[PDB]
Amino acid sequence: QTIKDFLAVAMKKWTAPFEPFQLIDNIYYVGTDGIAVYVIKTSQGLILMDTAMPQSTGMIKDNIAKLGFKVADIKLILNTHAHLDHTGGFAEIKKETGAQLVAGERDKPLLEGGYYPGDEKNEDLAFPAVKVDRAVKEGDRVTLGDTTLTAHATPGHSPGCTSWEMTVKDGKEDREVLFFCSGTVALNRLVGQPTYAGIVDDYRATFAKAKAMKIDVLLGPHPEVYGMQAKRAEMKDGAPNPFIKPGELVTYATSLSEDFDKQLAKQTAALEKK
Ligand SMILES: [Zn+2]
Ligand SMILES: [Zn+2]
Ligand SMILES: [Zn+2]
């Protein structure tokens, strides 16, 4: 991986438009073609799940309005993890709306500083700093009106990476949704000068945890996590909701664990003096 390539991709597919849509029950997709953002409609206002790159905040606000929502009705902002491709609009939206920001406790310093962990002087990974109103840990519950989400600590990709669980209806039946936080290696350093202390252990705890969770609908902060576009194509009035795939988090976490092993080996070999 190169940071140049990360930025190149980040300034292309990550900023390209995608038509917003009702995904399941009160969960609506309002992200880009490469970064997933969601509105959760409650009886007491909107919950915003993540934002996108700093340059894309206007696009996200536009997508919200395209669905008939008001940006002003956002009361809570939740974060999966504190990297600029997910936090770029937090300061702006929080100021505009007066919403409270909720995030994993170990990501609080990242959010409040607007920097990438272990690469804190890199301005192309910086974002506008934002205050955290509530810092969460494993099992904490966050409620707006009729809707409650449960925090799960799934560190590795960031130290405070938080996967959020909530129940939706599919017809008469409950289905459990996870907004998985990310388990990719991406720009992180695993060995040598690791991005943060204990990162390797965190990733492997997270892959195992993910495989053991009872989840009907896998979501995530990039559409690639759950094959969003292919599922959207299969949506049809009266047909089963294609986002319900209860074995998918096991399959996806297995693919992540296998890639993790590859990247750990690669970085370990790269540390050898040549
Ligand atoms: Zn990230
Ligand atoms: Zn990301
Ligand atoms: Zn948990």
Q: Which ligand is nearest to the CA of 50?
A: 2
Q: How far is CA 202 from CA 4, 72, 197, 218, 236, in A?
A: 26, 37, 9, 20, 39
Query: Ligand 2 centroid vs 18 CA: distance in angstroms?
Result: 17
Burial of 264 per CB tally in 10 Å (0-12, 13-18, 19+): middle
Domain that holds residue 40: 1-274
Query: Ligand 3 centroid vs 75 CA: distance in angstroms?
Result: 25
Q: Cα-atom radius of gyration of the chain, to the nearest Å? A: 18
60 CB-side CA count, 13 A: 29
Residues 147, 78: contact at Cβ < 8 Å?
A: no
Query: Ligand 2 centroid vs 77 CA: distance in angstroms?
Result: 17
81 labeled part of a ligand binding site: yes
Scan for tokens 């939740």, then name that residue.
Answer: 78
Number of independent structural domains in the chain: 1
Q: Which ligand is nearest to the CA of 9?
A: 2
Question: HEC states along the chain?
Answer: CCHHHHHHHHCCHHHCCCCCEEEECCEEECCCCCCCCEEEEECCEEEEECCCCHHHHHHHHHHHHHCCCCHHHEEEEECCCCCHHHHCCHHHHHHHHCCEEEEEHHHHHHHHHCCECCECCCHHHCCCCCCCCEEECCCCEEEECCEEEEEEECCCCCCCCEEEEEEEEECCEEEEEEECCCCCCCCCCCCCCCCCCCHHHHHHHHHHHHHHCCCCEEECCCHHHCCHHHHHHCCCCCCCCCCCCCCHHHHHHHHHHHHHHHHHHHHHHHHCCC
Method in brief: X-ray
138 labeled part of a ligand binding site: yes
In angstroms, the CA 189 to CA 208 distance is 21
User: Structure resolution in Å?
Assistant: 1.2
Residues 138, 131: contact at Cβ < 8 Å?
A: no
Phi, psi angle pair for 88, to nearest 5°: -60, -25
Of the candidates 83, 117, 103, which has an alpha carbon nearest to the alpha carbon of residue 7? Answer: 83
User: What distance separates the 2 farthest-apart alpha carbons in the chain?
Assistant: 62
Q: What is the CATH number for 4?
A: 3.60.15.10
Dihedral sign from CA coordinates of 127, 128, 131, 132: negative
Structure tokens at 197: 């202390």
